[PDB]
Amino acid sequence: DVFGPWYLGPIAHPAIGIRIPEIILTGILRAYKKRNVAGGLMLSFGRETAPEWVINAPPGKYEITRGHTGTSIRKYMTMAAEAAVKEGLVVEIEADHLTVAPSAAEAVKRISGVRTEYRMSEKELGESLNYIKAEIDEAVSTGYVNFYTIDTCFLIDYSAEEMSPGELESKFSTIFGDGAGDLLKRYVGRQFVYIGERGIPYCFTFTNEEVMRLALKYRESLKATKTICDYIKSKMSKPYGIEIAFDETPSLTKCKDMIFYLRELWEIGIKPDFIAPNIGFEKRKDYMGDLKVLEERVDKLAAIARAFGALLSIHSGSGSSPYSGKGIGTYEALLRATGGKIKYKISGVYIELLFELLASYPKGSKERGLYEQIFDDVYQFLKKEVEEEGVLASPELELQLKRYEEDVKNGVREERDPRADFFRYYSFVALNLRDSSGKRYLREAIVELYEEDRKFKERYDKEVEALTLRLIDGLKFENNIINALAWIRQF
Ligand code: NI
């Protein structure tokens, strides 16, 4: 009998972040149980979660952005595993975005519309890797981790695309040496053909110059991915999978880049189950492009991933509102493009939902008082970050803060609107703000409200379940457990 944490393999499934496992797990597991779903439960190792020793550190040691949910790796993994065992459910415990980066604030800025174009030192690379290993150690120590997403997008060298032909060749020869010819031979003068769900065969060929650029573009990303995957392999006594996070990049993912990246991974002995391309999805927004163009693009990239025994993993899955999915028509275009064989990720949307729910109670109520305190403390914390040029300060944040001010001044927007841009993007800091005794006072209050107020618990659980069911029914994950067991049985 199969239940609790299992590695599900490259099969269609939702994977859902649990920023406050205490309040979110009931509604999610209800929905999973109702639609007979094998789902993932996760948090991002670069931003949302952190090791215990980061979480339990005193105020001020670590940037607000590191483990900003207040939820440790041990905690989310143990709570989710144990909840699932208790509910008789198969789930996958995933470590989302193992992120190479100089800081969590940079990893956050990256997905909040902030132009930083920072460049990492060698010591920084080393420490980021050590941070990741330590995070891994905590995951492994729980006995429950099934799956890791690796994010080395910070290491992608965009200068390789702009090098002079003479500089290019010279660097290529020097780096790759006697392996240069082998590397070119894998690609140049070959017609690659990948067939999508549509039945359209897509043709790709490569010039030497293209291969040389791709190779220089991705060498550091590939090397770090290798180091991370070797460390995971050295520590895991149970089977697991890898996802490549390839989505937090400045432009759309190109077909040839992905062919190359997956193939080079393959050459060094890494076969991801999932790859997450940039397809034009943005955090906190319904899809803002042409649905036909989207389907076309996803059909191609899905076909490519398929030939490497992989599915696409869709990040930035939540949209403009907790109720909007990712826009009308968006799920249908993804399903046609993938025949339903797809992994889809959401996380932050559950806290947006929490906050708007609190905001919807009447002034006079404690629920709404709590909301207003959250909003006020966030606003003031961020003003102070801009004021003191703290770690989250940026021109973009400053503008959003001014936009909110202007709008309330001109009666365009009401005070404490949870839809104000700055709050939508930066409300996450609420869960890591601390009182003078260093407690996460707002996260503690939320959990208290939930644990002690029966009517609040009930309404939130219903909203969480409902949101998870919209995702499940929208992307046809109902009964996906069948393929998960077909994978597991093979072992
Ligand atoms: Ni993501």
Strand 274-277 to 192-195 pairing: unpaired
Structural domain spans, the chain: 4-348+463-489, 353-460
Report the amino acid identity of residue 166: G
- Fold (topology level) of 4-348+463-489: TIM Barrel (3.20.20)
Query: How many Cα atoms sit within 13 Å of 343 on the Cβ side?
Result: 34
Rounded Cα distance between 343 and 432, Å, is 29
Q: Of 60, 119, 21, 76, nearest to 436 (Cα)?
A: 60
Handedness of CA 351, 353, 355, 358 (dihedral sign): negative
| Helix residue ranges per DSSP H, 61-207 | 73-86, 104-110, 122-141, 165-176, 180-185
Asked how this structure was determined, the answer is: X-ray
* CA distances from residue 43 to 50, 103, 297 in whole angstroms, order as listed: 9, 17, 28
Within a 10 A sphere around the Cβ of 417, how many other Cβ atoms? 17
Q: Provide the residues around ligand 1 (an ion) whose CB is within 5 A.
A: 315
Distance from the alpha carbon of residue 348 to the mean position of ligand 1, in angstroms: 10
Helix, coil or strand: residue 217: helix
Helix, coil or strand: residue 348: coil
Rounded Cα distance between 24 and 465, Å, is 9
Q: Which residues pair with 325 in a beta bridge?
A: 327
Q: Of 267, 271, 308, nearest to 179 (Cα)?
A: 267
Name residues whose C-beta falls within 8 Å of residue 256's C-beta, 6 or more positions apart in sequence. 204, 206, 210, 214
Rounded Cα distance between 76 and 84, Å, is 12
Q: Of 92, 107, 183, nearest to 146 (Cα)?
A: 92
Distance from the alpha carbon of residue 315 to the mean position of ligand 1, in angstroms: 5
Distance from the alpha carbon of residue 92 to the mean position of ligand 1, in angstroms: 16
Q: Of 463, 284, 444, nearest to 370 (Cα)?
A: 444
Distance from the alpha carbon of residue 97 to the mean position of ligand 1, in angstroms: 7
* Greatest C-alpha distance within the chain: 74
The tokens of 294 are what? 């989207």
Q: Which residues pair with 344 in a beta bridge?
A: 14, 314
Q: What is the DSSP string of 396-428?
A: HHHHHHHHHHHHHHTTSS-TT-TTSHHHHHHGG
Helix, coil or strand: residue 98: strand
Rounded Cα distance between 396 and 409, Å, is 20
Distance from the alpha carbon of residue 299 to the mean position of ligand 1, in angstroms: 21
Give 437: exposed, middle or buried? Use CB within 10 Å, 0-12, 13-18, 19+.
exposed
Which helix H or strand E contains 241, and what residues bound it? strand 241-246
Rounded Cα distance between 46 and 50, Å, is 7
Residues 82-114: b if buried by 16+ CB within 10 A, e if exposed: ebbeebebbbbbbbbbbbbbbbbbbbbbbbbeb
Distance from the alpha carbon of residue 303 to the mean position of ligand 1, in angstroms: 21
